[PDB]
Design a binder for this molecule. Structure first.
Ligand SMILES: NC(=O)c1ccc[n+]([C@@H]2O[C@H](COP(=O)([O-])OP(=O)(O)OC[C@H]3O[C@@H](n4cnc5c(N)ncnc54)[C@H](O)[C@@H]3O)[C@@H](O)[C@H]2O)c1
Ligand SMILES: NC(=O)c1ccc[n+]([C@@H]2O[C@H](COP(=O)([O-])OP(=O)(O)OC[C@H]3O[C@@H](n4cnc5c(N)ncnc54)[C@H](O)[C@@H]3O)[C@@H](O)[C@H]2O)c1
Ligand SMILES: CC(=O)N[C@H]1[C@@H](OP(=O)(O)OP(=O)(O)OC[C@H]2O[C@@H](n3ccc(=O)[nH]c3=O)[C@H](O)[C@@H]2O)O[C@H](CO)[C@H](O)[C@@H]1O
Ligand SMILES: CC(=O)N[C@H]1[C@@H](OP(=O)(O)OP(=O)(O)OC[C@H]2O[C@@H](n3ccc(=O)[nH]c3=O)[C@H](O)[C@@H]2O)O[C@H](CO)[C@H](O)[C@@H]1O
Lengths: 308, 307
């Protein structure tokens, strides 16, 4: 049985990927420092699962972790953009050095396929209010965003210089069960859903007209598995957004209806770094992957709410 | 007023150090002497202070910026090929040193930093076209990705912490003290050393390739203006002259300077070589006082006369 190394596999997106890889018959090795990841997210009773707790920027750990692995999915990073604004030096280790060290370890081990979690943040404000195509000029505004873009550049260098096979995916806004809502900068759907379940007020920053291209985690996981299994993945990046439009106000009403309970909406000022309109151009994604019928917002919110 | 020059013992840096001392600045050099040479520096000037160490070293940088009014950040492993051979080690010099400097400048309250970026951030996208600053980016090596990442971090420190970066993308700089010791050294430093020594040169390709060559003294003038301008622009500026010199032109010009003919061996075209590279220097002309730059023949004669 083939083995998949998944960095950041104990986190929100990773642990769902781990569940799906195991069900398909893969062996899975998780590398995670448990900074936001959780052992309780993993099916520790699965004989096909191994867990290494450590830093993904640690070259000695990566030299051990890649041995016996046939492919990689690189999800480890400090996901909070705001954390990179507060501490660019520390987060640069997790958000870029880990990518560089993984490229070194994969090339030494002879492993070619790596699926990489890049981010819509590399566009910055360029293309706002339009479907953002992948060749939109880049404008990373934070150390996180610049580190994701730098990661793409280095992955492409190892592709051309050393035969690596990167699958670069720029996630738009992912949501669903296990997304951690404990931070004021957690994803808005995890925060809003947690408050609605508890019967407590949510806070809306701005007028609510901001739009996001939300993707339910199970649809992203399908794309991640396809990235591991495709015979000759494209060299350049692929947006993972649906090209859908959801205002925060749409989200508030849909969530309130699903919860069956009243929802108080308090106000706060528009966030300083807030992009108003964000939407992916889905053409490369629809050409390169079989999306099937993705979950609608309502379907994804219901699955989230019913899990808590 | 004291200026910190990281990489100040190198080719461009030491010419800058000379100019800054001549203008009355005190100058502090931070250099690890990997390629820089103390012989490039006017040691015992009494306005010159030399620190030897790693520009990525946090504690050394904290000392180096203390008492400094401005910074020129030239330290990097200049060789693209060394970054191909060792991405991990060169990332420390080519990017971490920039991040650590941003941190040290913010803590010490120093705003102005002139930064040596590079035409390599464009990859091959500039082939055959005047290369403007919004030419799409395609850094092909760790060196080029690190220069561009340095740019992005510098802009983040500008918006988040009040830094004043002057981002300059150098095209093909040449002149005295440029190390001709590598096969990948600048073509002018290699051809000039061979012409002075009366030894054959190797031309990779047909010699029709064109480059936008900039004599180091003209770049140094731009660097000083970056330090002294009252309100520099936030985005990058290409440093080229918009000049077009074929390698066959360069060979003929050097033959005429040296007085002897140059034997020219024929090599294959380098893989990935850009055939036609020219800056669109409109932003340079608008933001800086270019005066009358040295022609190629002028810069070649000054280089050749110093060998
Ligand atoms: N909307 C989204 O969720 C979204 C959007 C764009 C990009 N991404 C990217 O997707 C990936 C997964 O994010 P997520 O939403 O599941 O959040 P997450 O925080 O739950 O997952 C991040 C995981 O990485 C682990 N990790 C962090 N630093 C590490 C290190 N130095 N060494 C080892 N493990 C480390 C954490 O413990 C956690 O399990 C990240 O790269 C993130 O930046 C997510
Ligand atoms: N045509 C060109 O010469 C050209 C073109 C584009 C960019 N640049 C950039 O201009 C700057 C100067 O390059 P140069 O042509 O003068 O070459 P150079 O090698 O002579 O100068 C580089 C200097 O930086 C120093 N240095 C290197 N790593 C260091 C470290 N970790 N800590 C401290 N000092 C360190 C070296 O000792 C040397 O003195 C570099 O950033 C280079 O990438 C040059
Ligand atoms: C990539 O980051 P994003 O800003 O796209 O993701 P995000 O989930 O952090 O924010 C989505 C939107 O919801 C807003 N928001 C977020 C949290 C909250 O409690 N209330 C709220 O209104 C936030 O200002 C933003 O406009
Ligand atoms: C010295 C230098 O800064 N080189 C940089 C410059 O390369 P460039 O190719 O622009 O400059 P170069 O000086 O390395 O070479 C210019 C031309 O001369 C040719 N040639 C060179 C040596 C020789 O002995 N014979 C010969 O024919 C060479 O193949 C090339 O066609 O720009 C690139 C980015 O786009 C990289 O940043 C390179 O590192």
């Amino acid at each position: 049985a083939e083995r998949i190394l998944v960095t950041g596999g104990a986190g929100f997106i990773g642990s769902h990927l781990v569940d799906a890889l195991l069900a398909k018959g893969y062996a899975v090795r998780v590398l995670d420092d448990l900074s936001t990841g959780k052992v309780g997210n993993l099916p520790m009773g699965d004989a096909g699962l191994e867990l290494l707790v450590g830093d993904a920027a640690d070259a000695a750990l990566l030299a051990d972790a890649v041995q016996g692995c046939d492919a990689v999915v690189h999800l480890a990073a400090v996901a909070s953009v705001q954390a990179s604004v507060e501490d660019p030096v520390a987060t640069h280790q997790s958000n870029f050095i880990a990518t560089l060290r993984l490229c070194e370890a994969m090339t030494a081990a002879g492993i070619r396929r790596v699926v990489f979690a890049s981010a819509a943040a590399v566009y910055g404000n360029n293309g706002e209010g339009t479907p953002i195509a992948e060749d939109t000029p880049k404008s990373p505004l934070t150390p996180f965003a610049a580190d994701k873009l730098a990661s793409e550049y280095y992955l492409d260098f190892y592709r051309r210089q050393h035969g690596l096979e990167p699958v670069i995916l720029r996630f738009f806004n992912i949501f669903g069960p296990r997304q951690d809502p404990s931070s004021p900068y957690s994803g808005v759907i995890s925060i809003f859903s947690e408050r609605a379940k508890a019967g407590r007020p949510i806070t809306l920053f701005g007028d609510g007209g901001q739009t996001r291209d939300f993707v339910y985690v199970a649809d992203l996981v399908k794309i991640l598995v396809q990235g591991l299994e495709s015979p000759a993945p494209a060299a350049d990046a692929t947006n993972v957004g649906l090209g859908g439009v959801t205002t925060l106000n749409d989200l508030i009403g849909a969530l309130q209806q699903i919860s069956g309970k009243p929802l108080q909406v308090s106000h706060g000022a528009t966030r300083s770094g807030d992009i108003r309109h964000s939407k992916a151009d889905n053409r490369r994604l629809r050409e390169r992957f079989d999306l099937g019928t993705p979950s609608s917002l309502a379907e994804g919110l219901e699955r989230l709410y019913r899990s808590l």
